[PDB]
Amino acid sequence: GLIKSLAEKEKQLLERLEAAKKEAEERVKRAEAEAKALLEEAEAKAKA
Amino acid sequence: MEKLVLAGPKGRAKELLQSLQQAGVVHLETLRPEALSAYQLSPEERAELRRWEAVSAGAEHTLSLLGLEAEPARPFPEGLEAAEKALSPIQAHAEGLTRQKQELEEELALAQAYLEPLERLAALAHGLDKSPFLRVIPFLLTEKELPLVEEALRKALEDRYLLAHEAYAGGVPALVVVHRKEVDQAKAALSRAGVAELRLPGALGELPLSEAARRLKERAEAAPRELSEVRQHLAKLARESASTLQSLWTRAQDEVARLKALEELASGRFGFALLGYVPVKAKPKVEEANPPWVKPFELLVSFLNTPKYGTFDPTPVVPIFFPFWFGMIVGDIGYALLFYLVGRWLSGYVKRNEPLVIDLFALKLKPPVLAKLVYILNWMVFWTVVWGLIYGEFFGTFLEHLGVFGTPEHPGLIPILIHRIDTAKTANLLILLSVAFGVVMVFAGLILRAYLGLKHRHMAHFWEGVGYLGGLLGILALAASYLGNLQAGWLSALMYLGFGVFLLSVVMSSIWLMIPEIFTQAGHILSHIRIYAVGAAGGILAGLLTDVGFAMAERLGLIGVLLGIVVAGVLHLLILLLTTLGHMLQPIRLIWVEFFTKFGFYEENGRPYRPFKSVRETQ
Amino acid sequence: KLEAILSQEVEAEIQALLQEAEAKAEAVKREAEEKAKALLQARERALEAQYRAALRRAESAG
């Protein structure tokens, strides 16, 4: 009858899940950038 | 808050919602089936359900073995772990005891049969059954077979065979003793007559006769004592722990039902569905939210509240039943008089039956729970017998009198000589008085029948239902022209012509493709008249059998007749009961002409909801 | 009613997960610091040897 109930939880649930994907991606990217950059210094220092 | 899930039907969406809304549950929102999908049980949930079934079944298994099964309404909340640990020692112990018991019983059954033959046979060739030099073969022969067998063996085996027999009370167990290597020949001779070798089951059969015979005699003596013990240990275990199993059974069953509920709701198998929220406090509160007339009415209120069609309350049924039902009892000499006594045995208690124990604690032929339900019924019977005693003096208006009829209140020879309900004028009016109620019921069903199509908003039912009621008027009209002739009923001889127009004139407005079938609508009218007539007249007939059962049917009547008639009277009682119970089915037979033909009633050819017969079973 | 709130019971499980993997995004970095570091302890000792060796040779030559 009321379509309103089932619509408005579905599209709040969809946002919760997308927002889970967001902070998972925005983290793995970072961790690799940090590790890349640590070792760059370890090459910069090693030769010097 | 606790999330709660609700279902109902589409038809009652508003009525269900209003009721739930009131009950405790708040925040009710509707959910369509596409929303319910994707909330089917996860594999873990299905494993709990599988396991809950095992516990349910597993109890039924243990509890049946141990003795009798009983299903209470009292569960005991426990874990998966707690319920399975409870169940495992008792099922194991009981499984073990029943197995011994079966072996003990089979052994007895064989040993009881075959001890006497093996004793006889062993005796005949004592100490020669374990020799290699001589071969023995046991076999049974009847008196009839003995000569044939002997001839056959004698020709086959010459005169160097030994045929011996010894009796046992009936036939003879016979033994033929033959040389080793003459075995095949010996066998062949038995086989041609159709007689074959006797060998028992297991080790005994294979043992020498002498061993087998000694051991069988021992088993018959030992078994009955050990059987007694195993049966005793098993009885104690039931006695102490039958309850434990029963309480697991109930609890386990509630959990199975809950998880099944969620899988059904999940596949979108309930059309109207709600979601709402209850605080922990509200959770109980949701589940929480003259005797003859009042008493059945208060239980019927549960059916007031759930309608299903354009139908009205199923409650007009009960006061139509009661006058007509009481008036099937009309005796006063050994019919209603005897029947008074019957009432007390169902509304009190007896022990004069075996399957029935004491009713006061709810123990009958019927299941113990069903017996507690039919207290109400038993009362409604008690009220019928009581009122029938009054309508037995109503009958005695038409019998007893000291001047009007030719039979006193109690003659001094024997009570009741000749019935005086054989006056022609007297029988006709009691039949015509009875007919009047049947007519009242014809109007009441078809008037509701029309109101049904008005508020169910199908004009085809409205139109058909209105028209058929015109025919009643014609039916009665026509009768008056014959009951009063032209002295009375010359006041309806001209309305009848027009009453006939009304029967057809409204029915045709719906058209209808079987116009003849209207004949059968007129059939239903006719029945209410005939059944009420049968209800009086057949009721009165009940009394007139009692003429020859507790009334003068010996000599000219005298002092001796009082205690002489009772020979025929007792024989007459069971005969009398069977035909008068046949009349008491008329109230329901009447009701069903109208009830299942949707005359302000729920039913109409099938459809869920019980016949009133089954409703009134408990009420 | 729980509707918008219905979504915060998931956002709390799916926040538990995302913290368990920011407890692995710390562990990974620990091991990688202890790796990067050890590659320069080997760098330190091997060079030290080659400087001990270079002055010793140059003394025997002198």
SS3 call for B8: strand
Q: Which of B331, B303, B335 is nearest to B316 (CA)?
A: B303
Residue in C11, C22, C32 nearest the CB of A35:
C32
- Residue B602 tokens, joined: 């729920």
B446-B450-B452 Cα angle (round to 5): 110
Q: Which of B577, B574, B569, B576 is nearest to B550 (CA)?
A: B569
Which one of B2, B30, B275 makes the best mutation probe of the C interface by having the most chain C beta carbons within 10 Å?
Answer: B275
SS3 call for B42: coil
8 Å CB contact of A35 and C29: yes
Distances (CA, A) of B39 to A5, A20, B22, B49, B257: 16, 21, 28, 16, 17
DSSP string, B143-208: TTTHHHHHHHHHHHHTTS-EEEE--SSSSEEEEEEEETT-HHHHHHHHHHHT------SHHHHHS-
State the virtual CA torsion across A12, A18, A20, A26 in degrees, nearest 10.
Answer: -140
φ/ψ of B137, rounded to 5, equals -135, 120
8 Å CB contact of A1 and B30: yes
Q: What is the largest CA-CA distance in chain B?
A: 118
B500-B454-B320 Cα angle (round to 5): 70
Please list the alpha-helical segments (H only) found in B456-604: 459-467, 469-483, 496-505, 518-544, 566-580, 586-595
- Pair B6, B273: CB distance under 8 Å: yes
CA B612 to mean position of chain CA atoms: 16
Beta bridge partners of B515: none
C-alpha span between B600 and B465 (Å, rounded): 11
- Pair B599, B449: CB distance under 8 Å: yes
Q: In terms of CA atoms, which chain C residue is nearest residue B3? A: C2
Beta bridge partners of B175: B138, B164
What is the number of other CB atoms lying within 10 angstroms of the CB of residue B9? 12
Contacts 24+ apart (CB under 8 A), A36-44: A38/C32, A38/C33, A38/C36, A39/C36, A42/C36, A42/C39, A42/C40
Beta bridge partners of B273: B7
Q: Say if strands B26-30 and B272-278 run parallel, antiparallel, or are unpaired.
A: antiparallel
Provide the experimental method for this PDB entry.
cryo-EM
DSSP string, B322-357: HHHHHTT---SSSSHHHHHHHGGGTSS---SSSS--
CA A41 to mean position of chain CA atoms: 26
- Residue B226 tokens, joined: 């050990």
- Pair B101, B230: CB distance under 8 Å: yes
Chain A from 1 to 48: CB within 8 A of any B CB = 1-6, 10
C-alpha span between B4 and B371 (Å, rounded): 36
DSSP string, C14-52: HHHHHHHTTTTTTHHHHHHHHHHHHTTHHHHHHHHHHHH
- Pair B113, B201: CB distance under 8 Å: no
* Contact status of A46 with chain C (Cβ, < 8 Å): yes
State the virtual CA torsion across B441, B445, B448, B454 in degrees, nearest 10.
Answer: -150
Burial B162-176 (b: 16+ CB within 10 A, else e): bbebeeeeebbbbbb
Burial B39-61 (b: 16+ CB within 10 A, else e): eeeeeeeeeebebbbebbebbeb
Q: Which residue has the tokens 């329901």?
A: B588
Q: In terms of CA atoms, which chain B residue is nearest residue A5? A: B29
- Pair B437, B469: CB distance under 8 Å: no
Q: Which of B266, B265, B322 is nearest to B292 (CA)?
A: B322
Q: Which residue has the tokens 């050890």?
A: C38
Q: Which of B468, B464, B494, B492 is nearest to B480 (CA)?
A: B492
C-alpha span between B548 and B551 (Å, rounded): 6
Which one of C7, C9, C24 makes the best mutation probe of the A interface by having the most chain A beta carbons within 10 Å?
Answer: C7
Q: Checking phi first, is residue B608 left (phi over 0); if not, alpha (psi -120 to 50) or beta?
A: beta
Measured between beta carbons, the chain B residues lying within 8 angstroms of C2 are 1, 3, 277
Q: What is the amino acid identity at position B284?
A: P
SS3 call for B279: coil
Contacts of B511 (CB under 8 A, 6+ apart): none
Q: Which of B536, B538, B537, B490 is nearest to B327 (CA)?
A: B536
Strand order in the sheet with B26-30: B2-8, B272-278, B26-30
Beta bridge partners of B604: B597
**From the CA of B274, how many Å to the nearest CA of chain A?**
10
- Dihedral (CA of B171, B173, B177, B180) sign: positive
Which helix (H) or strand (E) segment holds residue B6: the answer is: strand B2-8
